[PDB]
């Protein structure tokens, strides 16, 4: 058998808790160089789960872009599979925004420009990410101004050209597109819908669709029922609202594409269009947004262990 990961790498602390995989920091001992190892235990995986693992590995190898996490190596051992990535050390984007305290439209525009370039690259390679959400938006390092990196292609799918199909229910509820919730054939536009949700959050720090009743959430998404309420939206530029509107368009064929959004003036003319005003309420809300997300995961795990 192959023990190349076991022999050549040392594993250290966990970096990310996945549903069926874990990410740990690792060091290639001979080189001293650090990486991230995404580890799947393959012993008791179904045939379908093997196929999805092999799909993710394929897509990760395919995608090479400054704003996408880069695969370094892939190693199959007897009972484990390792995807070894170049290690990004800046943490989650949303955590960094809160930690660095000050945030404006100009900051959000530069952030979402990088995300859109990553998404454009995926789409140009025939890949739909399907899991654009805050946990998958990392920073390359702790350097002030570090690049955004798109991560976690566990849900990503391969499409053929512009052909739409029902690729299944997958994703996080608050980011799901109307076409997926209607069980319509879908494709690349689902990523742009998720981008619109992310952008909305980057501007005011809370999500455009939220409801404890998931059935009510899905009706709100399908109706495109978001709002730009006062007072926080009163200071948001018209061009930022316009880009959000074009991303949160419920008809996927009329929704703005990644290439089109990169040409939108709030993105392409950020220096003269995006506001530089610090949005304190946004950072305040983002702080609660991140806390609710953490506690949701912690409390749901505690409740699961209580039911037993």
């Amino acid at each position: 058998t192959c023990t190349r990961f076991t022999e050549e790498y040392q594993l250290f602390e966990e970096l990310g808790k996945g549903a069926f995989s874990v990410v740990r920091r690792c060091v290639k001992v001979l080189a001293g160089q650090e990486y991230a190892a995404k580890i799947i235990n393959t012993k008791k995986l179904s045939a379908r789960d093997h196929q999805k693992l092999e799909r993710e590995a394929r897509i990760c190898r395919l995608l090479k872009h400054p704003n996408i996490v880069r695969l370094h190596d892939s190693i199959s051992e007897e009972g484990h599979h390792y995807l070894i990535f170049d290690l990004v050390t800046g943490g989650e984007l949303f955590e960094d925004i809160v930690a660095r305290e000050y945030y404006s439209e100009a900051d959000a525009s530069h952030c979402i420009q990088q995300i859109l370039e990553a998404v454009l690259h995926c789409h140009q390679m025939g890949v739909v990410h399907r899991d654009l959400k805050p946990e998958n938006l990392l920073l390359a390092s702790k350097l002030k101004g570090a690049a955004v990196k798109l991560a976690d292609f566990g849900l990503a799918i391969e499409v053929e050209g512009e052909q739409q199909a029902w690729f299944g229910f997958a994703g996080t509820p608050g980011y799901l597109s109307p076409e997926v919730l209607r069980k319509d054939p879908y494709g690349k536009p689902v990523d742009l819908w998720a981008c619109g949700v992310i952008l909305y959050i980057l501007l005011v720090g809370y999500p455009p669709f939220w409801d404890e009743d998931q059935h009510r959430l899905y009706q709100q998404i399908k109706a495109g029922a978001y709002d730009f309420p006062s007072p926080e939206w009163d200071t948001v530029t018209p061009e930022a609202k316009d880009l959000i509107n074009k991303m949160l368009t419920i008809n996927p064929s009329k929704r703005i594409t990644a290439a089109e959004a990169l040409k939108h003036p709030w993105i392409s003319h950020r220096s003269t269009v995006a506001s530089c005003m610090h949005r304190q309420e946004t950072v305040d809300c983002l702080k609660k947004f991140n806390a609710r997300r953490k506690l949701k995961g912690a409390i749901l795990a505690a409740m699961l262990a209580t039911r037993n």
Partner: protein
């Protein structure tokens, strides 16, 4: 970790050293709120008020800290 959980509860408590049941109900889905309300002991430390819940004691105990 317990540190992250405590800090997150503290955020939803508006940086108070305790949290109130109504704050859990506002900020968390109902069953998550009630799970916490049922298991958080009374906070009696500095600045306590009636109904103050000890999210830190709850979180530390959960993870053996």
């Amino acid at each position: 970790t317990a540190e992250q959980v405590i800090a997150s509860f503290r955020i939803l408590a508006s940086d108070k050293p305790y949290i109130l049941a109504e704050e859990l109900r506002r900020e968390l889905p109902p069953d998550q709120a009630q799970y916490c309300i049922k298991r958080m002991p009374a906070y009696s430390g500095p600045g306590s008020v009636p109904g103050a819940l000890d999210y830190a004691a709850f979180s530390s105990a959960l993870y053996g800290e």
